[PDB]
Amino acid sequence: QPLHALRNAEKVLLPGYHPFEWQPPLKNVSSRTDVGIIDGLSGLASSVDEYPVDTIAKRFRYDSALVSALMDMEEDI
DNA sequence: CGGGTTTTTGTCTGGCTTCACACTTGATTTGCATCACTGTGTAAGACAGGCCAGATCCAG
Length: 77
Known about the structure:
Radius of gyration: 17 Å
Family: Belongs to the RAG1 family.
Shape: flat
Organism: Mus musculus
Helix content: 10-25%
Subcellular location: Nucleus
Order of helices and strands: HEEH
Protein name: V(D)J recombination-activating protein 1
Distance between the termini: 30 Å
């Protein structure tokens, strides 16, 4: 298959594609279930007045990552 | 320099396939250009200069 077909099929495996909900709502955690690669700094202030920032980071959301991991192991279970 | 004897083929002949060929338009799928960067360049040798040490020389 050409590259666009592969890229399109990739979206099924990445986190933020399957619906779910926690029965007790998670405190201080959003309920939206389509986030992908959240920024690592998490909205950290990067102006000139605050503490200087000299790092970069990328990461998924924890619950979405667990959901994707569990869905990747459906046939096994 | 050209006579015999099979190969190598396009047809004649007209009549049966299986694919070929006008139009759309709205998607859907491929194909290709573009952009900010990457690695491989990766240990020793030649030469001048300050510094004492000790040899080189001076004079009572």
